[PDB]
């Protein structure tokens, strides 16, 4: 509380000049900026800086009154539990004039908001100008959802008669129908990982260089996850001498298709497909696709990639190629071309009948068959 | 910057009347509306229109001062880098008085908002007055998710021994256990689509009128999707002469159930069920359900529908009937009644053990069995 | 519209004191609070209460002017289609000074909001300071999604040769490979529920006390869901006399593992696992886990629970233990320890290869096998 009313009439003229000088200021209370020191030069009528220098005169106004004036002075305005003040020069990207609403102790930003979600445990999203509750599926991620694999043998190259539910298998190596050679390509066994193996202090088979390279790429370096694990076979495909179905990669190098799926019945869900598999180049060079065609999206170890990217030689890379095709089927779905004589290592393929996001997997996803018991 | 202070005292009275006339206006700066021309009639004290007519006097105030006045004039107020001004007459639906905050060049709407999502790649939804991050599953749609089909033969009417993973099959027509006749209804083979068929320039079997009608309904008119595709059989069910389990449709016409599922063990997931199948009426009439009972929701080619709707005769329609039942089982789940002697064409049924949204499918969804290799 | 301009100069001094007393008030129009009666005591200069007592003087200001005054009076300010007025003392939790914007008929809260979702049917969530559309999966819940079960026999203890798709089975009791005894534990048949049973007016087998206890726990008390249902066997595991793998519960009582899964290949999806099963304690005591280890989350009939909670004796409880393990496999996954000689009743187990939320299930989730036709 404060007053400037009353006072002898003898001095009314001083206070009357005084009140006119504010009534002139009150047109729009906008400050050009906050200052800890009175501008000693370059100020005129209409210049208002917030004199917040250390002392009792913090936040006091510092309007300079020279134009149309007898003697210019730094007229002061102590605030008192002040409130919203607009600022013109700087502004938010959304076109809002900056406002420091002085809450009485600090310069606070203006506050709004015409909607708060009811506190009843449901998440609400904006819909047609109204907030609508969301379901539980919104919060759950996709890397953990247990979707069904379409491969009967899990890519272990042991045959469908092997139980996918068992940790260990005794069946020998077996070719998979999901990987058919193309252009004369030859597929041969590359290696196998055994439970309780001897390389890490056991009595089983030993691990060959390719498997250590994979596991180091997998991050499974700890005994609990490196000395134990599920069994499976690896294979190495040698590109044939045939030169059918040519294609060029992102680097402009021509290559030919080496493997095919045998026209599997996967393109059903909106034409959507997903292929995830682990590979490494032992010799030669290869790329993905031919050129950007239709819709496509490639992730390499969780990093988006473009068509034709030449995978670095002798490194394990996680690929996830998801695209859409209403044709209902395709034989060369992978769209992978490699140079003749290239030795490509690959292990644990996984295919899905739609767009799914399991992340960087570490083992094939299970299914159910007659031998699954 | 501007000033009206000073000036000889001789004329102080003019400016003093002047400042009083504003101090009267400053009670609440609300404009009745924007005008490009001064109102030549129908204005009085308290009427304030924004004179924005073309010229230098844009945005100048146009308050008319007649009540309690000697001679009324259009007193002018040039703004200068102006700011928020409230408006009373019109208002937003949410009870907010309209505000054109003049940004110095244009009349801008007031701006607020007390929450912005952190720029770290996560989507945030409002929860109990706070923004909570959402999962990846929120963004993905439902028409592409590869869920597991419950039919062993894919509705191809070829038997479970046929591989659902193959594009082509050689097994002959075979009845499906998922469609059991009711009220004496007879189910007979209707047709088959063959890969590399001869109708579109091949050497295989030809396509009969029903299959062209379906495909035209399917939108598969292009050679890539019309001259090729997966094989499957069609069947036509002729309603029997029995009159058990009567029911009336939306048009008030009584009909009887014709087919049953044989009490399949589908009602497990919260009692939820989903049936999707493609059909066409060759003769007679039929409807869906008996009357609105329990919870129910029908889509016809993506368009919601009510119970008892009489499907148009001789057109292919996509139905998706999802409901809930805690009983754990039901034989007449479809709740479809047709007139006696009606010839109903149907192809590619698909059932699911819950509420799923695959859209307008084009082929049955695959499963895995012993013959799937 | 109103005016206080003009009037004879003789009385100019009264109105001039008058206008000064407002020009003093207009520094910041903040009211200390609304009052239906003028404060008869404890008021001074700067105290402004909204006199809203019943009568024509509603909303009129009640500023008391005593400091620096000749005679203090309750100066009145009728509003007219008023607008936003800030309030200092009380405030919103978000630091916003309370504002009752008088809409001319009622004291209305201030209104903002710089974003409304386009009215085109899509739900929008905030992302990096912008609203991004969400997918359909966001709205759908998780309790209804038809995910694939990993048990070949559905936990009916009838063998994999039994069809899971049929409501009724004739095969006798059969042990399940998914529940292997530990520490010498013995598993024996406990009971079976038969379709069209005689206990509820049929001709089939009768129901034993354990099954009524379960069903009453299930809420299936109605004839439609109590007199009918799917068939399955129950078993009772008697803990053995061996004392290997000790562990203590939340109450500090030591117990030993009684059953194991035989190292099933379930830990694939991000290492995520889900186990849901229905059990009741007939004798002894048991608890969950050993102590809080790694990540873990237990729901008991939809209510979250902590490790080591001793389940109440002789009550049916729904458990859902979901955890993560990158090891790829585990034999004692359940981590359940029971006292020696404890008689534990259990029925309808369900396991999943990831985090899933089917709610409180009433029957095992189906799968597909060679005998599923």
Author numbering:
A (entry chain B), B (entry chain B), C (entry chain B): 10 to 382
Text of the article:
Bacteriophage Casadabanvirus JBD30, from the order Caudoviricetes, is a temperate phage that infects the bacterium Pseudomonas aeruginosa. The virion of bacteriophage JBD30 is composed of an icosahedral capsid, long flexible non-contractile tail, and a baseplate. Using its baseplate, JBD30 attaches to Pseudomonas aeruginosa via the bacterial type IV pilus, whose subsequent retraction brings the phage to the bacterial cell surface.
The baseplate of JBD30 is terminated by a tripod formed by three trimers of receptor binding proteins (gp54). The N-terminal thigh domain (residues 1–118) connects the receptor binding protein to domain VII of the baseplate hub protein. The C-terminus of the baseplate hub protein docks into the centre of an α-helical bundle that each receptor binding protein contributes one α-helix to. The α-bundle is surrounded by peripheral β-sheets. The JBD30 receptor binding protein foot domain is structurally similar to sugar-binding domains of hydrolytic enzymes (such as xylanase, glycoside hydrolase, endoglucanase, mannose, galactosidase) and an enzymatically active domain of bacteriophage cba120 tail spike protein. Aromatic residues of two adjacent foot domains form a hydrophobic cleft suitable for sugar binding. Therefore, we speculate that the foot domain of the JBD30 receptor binding protein recognizes and binds the host cell lipopolysaccharide O-antigen.
